[PDB]
Amino acid sequence: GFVRTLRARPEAGGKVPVFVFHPAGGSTVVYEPLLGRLPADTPMYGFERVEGSIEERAQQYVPKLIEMQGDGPYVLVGWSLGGVLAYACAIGLRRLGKDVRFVGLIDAVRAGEEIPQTKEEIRKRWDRYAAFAEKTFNPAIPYEQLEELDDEGQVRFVLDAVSQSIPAGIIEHQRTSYLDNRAIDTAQIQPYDGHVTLYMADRYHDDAIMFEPRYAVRQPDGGWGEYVSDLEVVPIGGEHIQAIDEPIIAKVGEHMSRALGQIEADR
Ligand SMILES: CNC(=O)c1c(-c2ccc(O)cc2)oc2ccc(O)c(CN3CCC4(COC4)C3)c12
């Protein structure tokens, strides 16, 4: 289905599982370095890609989480897009009366300024892509047809226009890559009352920034303090893309190991 078993829990008993959520344009196999930095026999389950907006995706994850974990306790972790998803499932699980005891965001850092959900920003965004496209591959943007479509329809319209004038594999990967990245842009973040740990790097890469220049700035709280009162930030340095790999993940994992040991003590 959409759940990957990174390390199975025992048939009965054992430690609380860690649930990790896939990143944008990728799979939960990227949490394997983190797993090696966690306590021995920590179970870990990865939730992979499903369709919908952020809240509609959590409408599919939450019932599976409760099948696998019941009342709790819940430990939800995600890098890149995964962080938003883990947080979204923290809010869904809290409303159902579930015990969430750790939400771990690995550099799930919001744009320094809010991204407007407007028609003018649609036009600004498609002009930005258009200019890059003539550069890296050597016309009139039909704005009225694009402003009336969602992200999925926008992308289909633009691929169909190329066909009307590319191998299937390249297309499928960039379609999910782009859509997951827009899912981060468009996320409508809801307040959460539990404890959130945010592992914060220094900066997004110059590729991400060129796609949306408002990622050139990060607030100290990563954009989350308005929505979380019990917010902890762990500075890890480096770039967004290296927060998930060795050796920086060793710093993430040492911190998370202490949080999991405390959760195991209170059981
Ligand atoms: C190229 N980099 C990317 O991030 C993006 C890709 C894209 C397209 C095709 C691919 O194959 C791979 C990626 O589409 C996007 C659409 C909107 C957007 O605002 C961004 C910028 N991202 C949004 C959230 C972000 C901050 O944390 C990650 C950066 C992107």
Residue numbers in the entry: 1454 to 1591, 1595 to 1621, 1625 to 1726
Sentences from the paper on this structure:
Because Pks13 crystals were available to guide the synthetic program, several ligand/Pks13 TE complexes were generated by crystal soaking as the project progressed. As 6 was the most promising molecule from the assessment of the P3 SAR, a crystal structure was obtained for the 6/Pks13 TE complex. Compound 6 made the same key interactions with the Pks13 TE domain as 1; these included a hydrogen bond between the hydroxyl of the P1 phenol and the amide side chain of Gln1633; a hydrogen bond between the hydroxyl at the 5 position of the benzofuran core with the carboxylic acid side chain of Asp1644; and a hydrogen bond between the protonated N of the P3 substituent and the side chain oxygen of Asn1640. There were also van der Waal interactions between the P3 substituents and the phenol sidechains of Tyr1663 and Ty1674. The 1-(aminomethyl) cyclopropan-1-ol 16 and the 2-oxa-6-azaspiro[3.4]octane 6 were potent in the Pks13 assay and had good MIC activity and microsomal stability, with reduced activity in the hERG assay. As highlighted during the SAR analysis, compounds 6 and 12 had the most promising in vivo activity, treatments with both agents resulting in an ∼3 log10 reduction in CFU. Compound 6 had the best all-round properties of the series, but as its in vivo efficacious dose was likely to be high, a cardiotoxicity study was performed to ensure that the hERG liability had been eliminated.
Polyketide synthase 13 (Pks13) was identified as the enzyme responsible for the last stage of mycolic acid synthesis, the condensation of two fatty acid chains into an α-alkyl β-ketoacyl chain, a direct precursor of the mycolates. Benzofuran 1 was identified as a potential lead for TB inhibiting a novel target, the thioesterase domain of Pks13. Compound 1 was synthesized originally during an H2L program based on an initial phenotypic hit that had been shown to target Pks13.16 Structural information generated during the H2L program identified the following interactions between Pks13 protein and 1;17 after a ligand-induced rearrangement, 1 bound in the fatty acyl substrate binding groove, blocking access to the Pks13 TE active site where the catalytic triad (Ser1533, Asp1560, and His1699) is located.
